[PDB]
From Swiss-Prot, chain A:
Full-protein positions shown: 1 to 50 of 550
Name of the protein in its database record: T-complex protein 1 subunit eta
Function field: Molecular chaperone; assists the folding of proteins upon ATP hydrolysis. Known to play a role, in vitro, in the folding of actin and tubulin. In yeast may play a role in mitotic spindle formation.
Protein family membership: Belongs to the TCP-1 chaperonin family.
Annotated compartments: Cytoplasm
Species assigned in the record: Saccharomyces cerevisiae (strain ATCC 204508 / S288c)
Quaternary structure and interacting proteins, as annotated: Heterooligomeric complex of about 850 to 900 kDa that forms two stacked rings, 12 to 16 nm in diameter.
Curated annotation (Swiss-Prot), chain B:
Subunit structure: Heterooligomeric complex of about 850 to 900 kDa that forms two stacked rings, 12 to 16 nm in diameter.
Function: Molecular chaperone; assists the folding of proteins upon ATP hydrolysis. Known to play a role, in vitro, in the folding of actin and tubulin. In yeast may play a role in mitotic spindle formation.
Domain of life: Eukaryota
Coiled-coil portions: none
Family stated for the protein in its record: Belongs to the TCP-1 chaperonin family.
Organism of this sequence: Saccharomyces cerevisiae (strain ATCC 204508 / S288c)
Gene from which this protein is expressed: CCT5
Protein name, UniProt field: T-complex protein 1 subunit epsilon
Entire-sequence positions represented here: 501 to 559 of 562
Transmembrane annotation, as ranges: none
Locations listed in the record: Cytoplasm
Length: 50, 59
């Protein structure tokens, strides 16, 4: 009845598509913005740096 | 010497003459040329000192 020896299961998303649940991703997104924020932290002000 | 006397045309004699007074040595420079040495230097170094983050993308 079957076409061959075995039949591997289908991944729902495409192979290599990154996905994650829970509170870890939104913390990573916030930490990503804070990482960009730290570059512009000492730039703010008249005595800031280029 | 320059603190004592007010005459301000005495400098470093490089050719080895016996007198350092430049009235006799025939040397003259422009004011716009000597001014730009200080202006372009002091205005650049402000930019050099204001750099904190230095990112260099390797070719």
């Amino acid at each position: 009845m079957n076409f061959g020896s075995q039949t591997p299961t289908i991944v729902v998303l495409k192979e290599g598509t990154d996905a994650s649940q829970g509170k870890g991703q939104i913390i990573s997104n916030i930490n990503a913005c804070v990482a960009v924020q730290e570059a512009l932290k000492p730039t703010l002000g008249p005595l800031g740096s280029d | 010497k320059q603190l004592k006397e007010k005459i301000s045309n005495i400098g470093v004699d490089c050719l080895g003459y016996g007198s350092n007074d430049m009235k006799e040595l025939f040397v003259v420079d422009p004011f716009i040329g000597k001014k730009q040495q200080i202006l372009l230097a002091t205005q650049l170094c402000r930019m050099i000192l204001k750099i904190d983050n230095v990112i260099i993308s390797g070719k």
